Design a binder for this molecule. Structure first.
Ligand SMILES: [Mg+2]
Ligand SMILES: [Mg+2]
Ligand SMILES: [Mg+2]
Ligand SMILES: [Mg+2]
Ligand SMILES: [Mg+2]
Ligand SMILES: [Mg+2]
Ligand SMILES: [Mg+2]
Ligand SMILES: [Mg+2]
Ligand SMILES: [Mg+2]
Ligand SMILES: [Mg+2]
Ligand SMILES: [Mg+2]
Ligand SMILES: [Mg+2]
Ligand SMILES: [Mg+2]
Ligand SMILES: [Mg+2]
Ligand SMILES: [Mg+2]
Ligand SMILES: [Mg+2]
Ligand SMILES: [Mg+2]
Ligand SMILES: [Mg+2]
Ligand SMILES: [Mg+2]
Ligand SMILES: [Mg+2]
Ligand SMILES: [Mg+2]
Ligand SMILES: [Mg+2]
Ligand SMILES: [Mg+2]
Ligand SMILES: [Mg+2]
Ligand SMILES: [Mg+2]
Ligand SMILES: [Mg+2]
Ligand SMILES: [Mg+2]
Ligand SMILES: [Mg+2]
Ligand SMILES: [Mg+2]
Ligand SMILES: [Mg+2]
Ligand SMILES: [Mg+2]
Ligand SMILES: [Mg+2]
Ligand SMILES: [Mg+2]
Ligand SMILES: [Mg+2]
Ligand SMILES: [Mg+2]
Ligand SMILES: [Mg+2]
Ligand SMILES: [Mg+2]
Ligand SMILES: [Mg+2]
Ligand SMILES: [Mg+2]
Ligand SMILES: [Mg+2]
Ligand SMILES: [Mg+2]
Ligand SMILES: [Mg+2]
Ligand SMILES: [Mg+2]
Ligand SMILES: [Zn+2]
Lengths: 97, 204, 126, 81, 151, 60, 100
RNA sequence: GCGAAGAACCUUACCAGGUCUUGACAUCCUUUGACCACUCUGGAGACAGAGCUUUCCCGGGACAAAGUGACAGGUGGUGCAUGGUUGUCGUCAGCUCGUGUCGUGAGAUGUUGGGUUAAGUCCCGCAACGAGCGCAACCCUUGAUUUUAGUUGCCAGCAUUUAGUUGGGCACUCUAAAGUGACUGCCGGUGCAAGCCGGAGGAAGGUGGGGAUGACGUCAAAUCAUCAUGCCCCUUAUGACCUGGGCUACACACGUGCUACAAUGGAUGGUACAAAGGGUCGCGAAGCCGCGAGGUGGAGCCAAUCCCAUAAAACCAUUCUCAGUUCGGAUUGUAGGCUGCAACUCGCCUACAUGAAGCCGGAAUCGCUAGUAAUCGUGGAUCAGCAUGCCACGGUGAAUACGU
C-alpha cells in the first residue's frame, strides 16, 4: 500500500540503492512491483564565455535528474521498519509514502 | 587558442564532483554555506597541505572528508585540533558537523600540492628555472606517467611579462580516458603576481 | 489481425491488418475525413500497390505525433511492415522498391551564434 | 493610479495646499513631487516644482487640472542644432 | 562542386495524372513551402484546359513544352575568347529546367486575374508558338546562332 | 563605490519594488541566476572545479 | 563625398587634427573619375613615450584599404598613412588593368 | 540587437540641491551592556524631538552604543607592469625534440621523393633511428533491435462511462538501465601495398547525420568595470547618505532587424494534426461578468496525475474585383485595463475614430548543399511590469552544382 520515489543526479549511484530496496523488501516476504523508470528532467544553462565582449561565443551546461518508482501492495510491519531503518548513500532522495 | 579546463571536461565521465548531495527549494543555501565552509577550511590549513575536501549532506547533518598528505599535523595531540575545527564549524554552520581524514600516499601525484609547493618556492626568491624541474623530477621519480608545468608573469623581476613551460612524459589533453589532474596557484611577489599551472597524467 | 509499427519524423503509427474488404480507418475516423486532401492518400496505398493486394486487407490504425504529412509516411512504413508480418514472402518486392527503410531525416538542432540551424547573420564589406 | 481605485497625490503636498486655504494666498508652495496629479483644490495657488536644478513656478489654472505637475516643468534644455 | 558530380534527387511521380514533369512544375510554383496552393492552382489549370479546348490536358502540356525547351545557349567563359559568349549545347536534363523556369517566370506576369488562369492560357499560347516564353526561346536561339564562330 | 553597494543591497529597502539581486561571491549586479545566486562568471569558473552538484557540460 | 568616423583613444579629438585628417584623406579622390561615397574610418592613439599610432580603413567599391602606422609624431604618421593608402591604390589599379 | 539573461524609483557608477566625518563596510581597546524595534510631531527624504520597553544569551559568546584610537574607503589612473578569462588565423594541418650525421659558421636531414586520403592519416623509398603536442579513436545525441520494468504511461482482445472513464491487461507505442549492431567485414575488378571502383546482406556503407573537443604561436588584440594584485593618486573627500533629473535629447550620418507594398490575397463563419519546456513567497482551471485588454471565483498540483495550453500556417465554404483600394499600418484625439508607494520626462495592452510613406527598391552587397534555404507558430533565462533581441522546439518544405 506504499509508494516510494527515488531521485538522484546520477543513475549509477541511484539504481544500486533502488535495487537494494527491492531485495531488502522482498526478502522479508513483500509483494513488490519493480522499479519503473520515469522520464528524466534535464535543464540547460547557456552562459557567455568571455568576460567583457564576444556575445557570439558561449558555453552551455546541463543538469539532469533521474527518477524511479517502487510499489508495495501487501506490506508487513517487518518490511516497513526494514525500509525505514535502512539508510541510503547521500546523493539520492527517497520520498516514502 | 584557449584550452578548456581539464577538470571541467572530465566531470561526470571519469572524474567526480566534490559536493555530493541532492537538494531543491533550498539549493542556494546549501551551495553558499558549502562555499563558506570551503573558504574557512582553506585559509586555515595552508601549512597542513590539504588537497581535496568533500561535503556529504544527510538530514540536517554535514559529513566533511579532508584529504591531506601530512595527516599528523591535521589531527591535534590526540584530536584536539580536529575537535576545535568541529566546534567552530558547528558554530558557523548552525547544524551538526562531522569530519574525517583520508591520508594521501605519494604526495607527488596531486597537482595542487605541487603547484602550491612551487608557489612557496617562488615566493622565497628561488629561480623558477630550478623549481619547475625540481618538482618535475620528484613527480616523475614518484612513478607518474606525465607532467607539465608552466609559470607566467613578471618573471625573475623583469619589466615585461612572459611565460615558461617544461614538460616530460606524456600528457594527452584531448583524450577522455585520461585521468589528468590540473591545478593553478598564485605566487605573490614584491614584483607583483605570478601564476603557476601544473598538470599531471597518472597511470592505469 | 497482424501488427505493425511505423515511425517517421516525430510521428508513430500502430497499424494492424485484418483480411477483408479494404475500408481504411484512421483513429476512429474515416480515411476521407481525417486526411481530406486527395493526393495525400496515395502514400498509404503504395505498399499495397507495389504488390497487387489492394482489396485484400482492412487496416486499423492508431497514430500520433507530427503533422498531416509525417504521419502519412509513418503509417506507410507501418502498413508495409505489417504486410511483411502477415506473409514472410513479400520482402523482395518491397525492399527492391525501397519501401522498408525508415527515413533517418529529422529536424536539425539550432546553434548558438546562428539565426537557424545553418543560417548565419548578415555581414558587410563596404 | 490610472485605475478606478482613485487619484494620486502625495500627502506632504495635499497637506500644504489645503493648509494654504486662507485668503492670504502669498505662500508659493515649493515642491519636489513632480508626480502628483493636479486636483480642483489646487485652483488659484502657485507651485514651484523642481525640474532637476531649480524650482520653476506654475500657476494652476482651470484647464490644467487632471494632469501631472511634472508636465509643466521641462527637464531638458533644447534650443536648436 | 569541387570534388565531383553529385547525384540528383529523383522526383516521385505525382498522383492523378501520373507524370514526372508535373511534380517538378508543382515544385516550381511553390512559395514558402506551400504545397497545397501550387497543387490546387495547377490541377485547376489542367482541368479548365480540357473544359476550354477539348483535348487531354497532358497532351496540350507536352506539345506546348516541346516548343519552349531550347537547344543552344550562350555561355560567357574562356576557350574561344575571354567571355565571348560561346554557344554550347545544353545537356538533356537542362532542357526541362529551363522550360519550367521560363513557363513560370512569365505566367506570373501575364496579368488578367488569379494566376489559376494565367498559367493555363500560357500553355495554350506555347502550344502554337506564341506568347512570351516561346519568344524567349526564339531570342535565345537567335543570340546563340549569332556567335557561330566562337564554338 | 563598491563595498557600500553590497551593504545597501543586504539592507531592507523602503519598498519591496526597490529590492534587487547581486552575485554572492562577487558583487556583480548584471546577469545573475536565481537558481544558484551566482553571476555568469562565478558559475563558469566554479562549475569546472566540480563544486556545483549535478551540473556538467552539455553536448547534446 | 567622403564620410569620416574619427576616434581618439587616450586623447581628445581637436578641430585642427580633424581638418588635417580631412584634407590629407581627401587628396585620395584624384585616382578616380567619379568621387566615391565610402565611409573613411580613422583611429588615433598616443602612448606614454610620445609615440603616436594612426589606423585608417576605407571600404572602396571593389577594394579595401587598410593602413596602420606608428611614429614619433601624429602628423608624420598621417602623412605616411596617406602614402601607404595611395600605394594600395596603385597596386590594385595596375593589377586590374593588367588583367584586362 | 556588443558588457546589458531585460535603465520609471532601486540598478546608477553621471548632474542639481540638502547633508556626515575612525565613517555605509571589517580586526582591534574602555565600559553600559541587548541595542534594536515600534508610535507620534517636523521635513522632499536623509534625518531631529519625545514616549514604550531592552526579558541580551549562556565570567565566555552574538550584536550594539558611547566617546576611543591604530584604520578603513575609491566602478580614481596605467590591460604597455601583471595573474585569471576570451576572440582570431582555424578544427587549418601543422609545431618541435633526444641521439646520430653533413657544414669553418648561422644552419641542414628526420618533416624531402611516389601513390593515397578529410588529415606529416598509411605504406613504400631514403643518413637516419625514435619520441612529444595536434589529426583519428575513448564522450553526448538521432536513426534499428533483445532482456528485465509496467505507474501517474498505453487500451488489441472484456463489459460500462461525458469520453482510458470504472473494474480489468502489460499485447502494441512509451519511459530508461544493461547489451547487440557498422568493422572495407564479405564478394568482383584493379594495385604490389596502402588504398580505389562496383555489388551483396542491413534500419544504417565507407570518419552514417549533429555536437563537445580549438597544437607551437601572431595581433604589446579585449577586460585594472566580474575578481585579485605592483606602483601612483584623493582622504573633512576622488569616501558616505537622501530627494529630483540623466543614460530615452535630435538639423543629420552608418550597422543589425520587424512590418508591408496585395488576389499563391484581404475579411467573415466551420474545423484537424505537434515537439521541447516552466510551476509552492508558484502555476493557477470550471462557473459568472465585460464587445475587449481583463475582473470575481477557487478545483487540482511538490507533478508521465493538475495548470500554463482547445498551436498557427494548412483544409472546406461565402464575399470582395485590380483601385494607393475591403492592401498597408504609421501618426494622432477620446475612454479604459494590469503591475508597482509611484506610469509627466519614461511601461505593456485594449475599444472607437483618424488614416501617412509605400505599387518590389540605383551602384553595390549577404546567407544557404536536404529535413538545409524559405515560411508558420511554441517554450525558456533576465523579470513586480516591459523584447521585433538571445537561447531552444517542432509543422509544411524546395531549386541547383556541367566545372576550377
Ligand atoms: Mg549578434
Ligand atoms: Mg554557450
Ligand atoms: Mg580559438
Ligand atoms: Mg555553433
Ligand atoms: Mg557560419
Ligand atoms: Mg572592490
Ligand atoms: Mg536600496
Ligand atoms: Mg527589479
Ligand atoms: Mg541584477
Ligand atoms: Mg582600450
Ligand atoms: Mg607626404
Ligand atoms: Mg539616487
Ligand atoms: Mg526619537
Ligand atoms: Mg526611544
Ligand atoms: Mg588600503
Ligand atoms: Mg593585451
Ligand atoms: Mg625544418
Ligand atoms: Mg581535420
Ligand atoms: Mg608527402
Ligand atoms: Mg601523427
Ligand atoms: Mg489515463
Ligand atoms: Mg580487393
Ligand atoms: Mg552498397
Ligand atoms: Mg561524424
Ligand atoms: Mg579529436
Ligand atoms: Mg585596437
Ligand atoms: Mg584598483
Ligand atoms: Mg562643510
Ligand atoms: Mg543605452
Ligand atoms: Mg485592413
Ligand atoms: Mg479562419
Ligand atoms: Mg510533452
Ligand atoms: Mg509560467
Ligand atoms: Mg516564465
Ligand atoms: Mg487550494
Ligand atoms: Mg505561456
Ligand atoms: Mg477575382
Ligand atoms: Mg503615458
Ligand atoms: Mg506612391
Ligand atoms: Mg496595385
Ligand atoms: Mg558545407
Ligand atoms: Mg553528402
Ligand atoms: Mg517577464
Ligand atoms: Zn560573481
Amino acid at each position: 500500500k506504499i509508494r516510494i520515489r527515488l531521485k538522484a543526479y546520477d543513475h549509477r549511484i541511484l539504481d544500486q540503492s533502488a535495487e537494494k530496496i527491492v531485495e531488502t523488501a522482498k526478502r522479508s516476504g513483500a509483494s513488490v512491483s519493480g522499479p519503473i523508470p520515469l522520464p528524466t528532467e534535464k535543464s540547460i544553462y547557456t552562459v557567455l564565455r568571455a568576460v567583457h565582449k564576444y556575445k557570439d561565443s558561449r558555453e552551455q551546461f546541463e543538469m539532469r535528474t533521474h527518477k524511479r518508482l517502487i510499489d508495495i501492495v501487501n506490506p508487513t510491519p517487518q518490511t516497513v521498519d526494514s525500509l525505514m531503518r535502512l539508510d541510503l548513500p547521500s546523493g539520492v532522495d527517497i520520498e516514502i509514502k | 587558442g584557449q584550452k578548456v579546463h581539464p577538470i571541467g571536461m572530465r566531470i561526470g565521465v571519469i572524474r567526480d564532483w566534490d559536493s555530493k548531495w541532492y537538494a531543491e527549494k533550498d539549493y542556494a543555501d546549501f551551495l553558499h554555506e558549502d562555499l563558506r565552509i570551503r573558504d574557512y577550511v582553506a585559509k586555515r590549513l595552508s601549512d597542513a597541505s590539504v588537497s581535496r575536501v568533500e561535503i556529504e549532506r544527510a538530514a540536517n547533518r554535514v559529513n566533511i572528508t579532508i584529504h591531506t598528505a601530512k595527516p599528523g599535523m591535521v589531527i591535534g595531540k590526540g584530536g584536539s585540533e580536529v575537535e576545535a575545527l568541529r566546534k567552530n564549524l558547528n558554530e558557523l554552520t548552525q547544524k551538526r558537523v562531522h569530519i574525517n581524514i583520508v591520508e594521501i600516499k605519494r604526495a607527488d601525484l596531486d597537482a595542487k600540492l605541487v603547484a602550491e609547493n612551487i608557489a612557496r618556492q617562488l615566493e622565497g626568491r628561488v629561480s623558477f628555472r630550478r623549481a619547475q624541474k625540481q618538482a618535475i623530477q620528484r613527480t616523475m621519480r614518484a612513478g607518474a606517467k606525465g607532467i607539465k608545468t608552466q609559470v607566467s608573469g613578471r618573471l625573475g623581476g623583469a619589466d615585461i611579462a612572459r611565460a615558461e613551460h617544461y614538460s616530460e612524459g606524456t600528457v594527452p589533453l584531448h583524450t577522455l580516458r585520461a585521468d589528468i589532474d590540473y591545478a593553478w596557484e598564485e605566487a605573490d611577489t614584491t614584483y607583483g603576481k605570478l601564476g603557476v599551472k601544473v598538470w599531471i597524467y597518472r597511470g592505469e | 489481425q497482424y501488427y505493425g509499427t511505423g515511425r517517421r519524423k516525430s510521428s508513430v503509427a500502430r497499424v494492424r491488418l485484418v483480411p477483408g474488404d479494404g475500408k481504411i480507418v484512421i483513429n476512429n475516423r474515416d480515411w476521407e475525413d481525417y486526411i481530406p486532401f486527395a493526393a495525400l492518400r496515395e502514400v498509404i496505398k503504395q505498399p499495397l500497390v507495389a504488390t497487387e493486394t489492394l482489396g485484400n486487407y482492412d487496416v486499423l490504425v492508431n497514430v500520433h505525433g507530427g503533422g498531416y504529412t509525417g504521419q502519412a509516411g509513418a503509417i506507410r512504413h507501418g502498413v508495409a511492415r505489417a504486410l511483411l508480418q502477415v506473409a514472410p514472402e513479400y520482402r523482395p518486392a518491397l525492399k527492391s522498391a525501397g519501401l522498408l527503410t525508415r527515413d533517418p531525416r529529422m529536424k536539425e538542432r539550432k546553434k548558438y551564434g546562428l539565426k537557424g540551424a545553418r543560417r548565419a547573420p548578415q555581414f558587410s564589406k563596404r | 493610479r490610472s485605475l478606478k481605485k482613485g487619484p494620486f497625490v502625495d500627502d506632504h503636498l495635499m497637506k500644504k495646499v489645503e493648509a494654504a486655504a486662507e485668503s492670504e494666498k502669498k505662500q508659493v508652495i515649493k515642491t519636489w513631487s513632480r508626480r502628483s496629479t493636479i486636483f480642483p483644490t489646487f485652483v488659484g495657488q502657485t507651485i514651484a516644482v523642481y525640474d532637476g536644478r531649480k524650482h520653476v513656478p506654475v500657476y494652476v489654472q482651470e484647464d490644467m487640472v487632471g494632469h501631472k505637475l511634472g508636465e509643466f516643468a521641462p527637464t531638458r534644455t533644447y534650443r536648436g542644432h | 562542386p569541387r570534388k565531383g558530380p553529385v547525384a540528383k534527387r529523383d522526383v516521385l511521380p505525382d498522383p492523378i495524372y501520373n507524370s514526372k514533369l508535373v511534380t517538378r512544375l508543382i515544385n516550381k510554383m511553390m512559395v514558402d513551402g506551400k504545397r497545397g496552393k501550387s497543387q490546387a492552382i495547377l490541377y485547376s489549370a489542367f482541368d479548365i484546359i480540357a473544359q476550354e479546348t477539348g483535348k487531354d490536358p497532358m497532351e496540350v502540356f507536352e506539345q506546348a513544352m516541346k516548343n519552349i525547351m531550347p537547344l543552344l545557349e550562350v555561355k560567357a567563359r574562356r576557350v574561344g575568347g575571354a567571355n565571348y559568349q560561346v554557344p554550347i549545347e545544353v545537356r538533356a536534363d537542362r532542357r526541362s529546367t529551363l522550360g519550367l523556369r521560363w513557363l513560370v517566370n512569365y505566367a506570373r506576369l501575364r496579368g488578367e486575374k488569379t494566376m489559376e488562369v494565367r498559367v493555363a492560357r500560357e500553355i495554350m499560347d506555347a502550344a502554337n508558338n506564341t506568347g512570351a516564353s516561346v519568344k524567349k526561346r526564339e531570342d535565345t536561339h537567335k543570340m546563340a546562332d549569332a556567335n557561330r564562330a566562337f564554338a | 563605490a563598491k563595498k557600500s553597494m553590497i551593504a545597501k543591497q543586504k539592507r531592507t529597502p523602503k519598498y519591496a519594488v526597490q529590492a534587487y539581486t547581486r552575485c554572492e561571491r562577487c558583487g556583480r549586479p548584471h546577469s545573475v541566476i536565481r537558481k544558484f545566486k551566482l553571476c555568469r562568471i562565478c558559475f563558469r569558473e566554479l562549475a569546472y572545479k566540480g563544486q556545483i552538484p549535478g551540473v556538467k557540460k552539455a553536448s547534446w | 563625398m567622403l564620410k569620416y568616423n574619427i576616434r581618439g583613444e587616450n586623447i581628445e579629438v581637436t578641430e585642427p587634427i580633424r581638418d588635417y585628417v580631412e584634407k590629407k584623406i581627401d587628396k585620395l579622390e584624384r585616382y578616380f573619375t567619379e568621387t566615391p561615397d565610402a565611409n573613411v574610418h580613422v583611429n588615433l592613439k598616443v602612448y606614454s613615450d610620445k609615440n603616436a599610432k594612426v589606423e585608417v580603413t576605407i571600404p572602396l567599391p571593389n577594394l579595401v584599404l587598410r593602413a596602420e602606422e606608428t611614429s614619433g609624431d601624429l602628423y608624420a604618421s598621417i602623412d605616411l598613412i596617406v602614402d601607404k593608402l595611395e600605394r594600395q591604390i596603385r597596386k590594385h589599379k595596375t593589377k586590374v588593368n593588367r588583367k584586362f
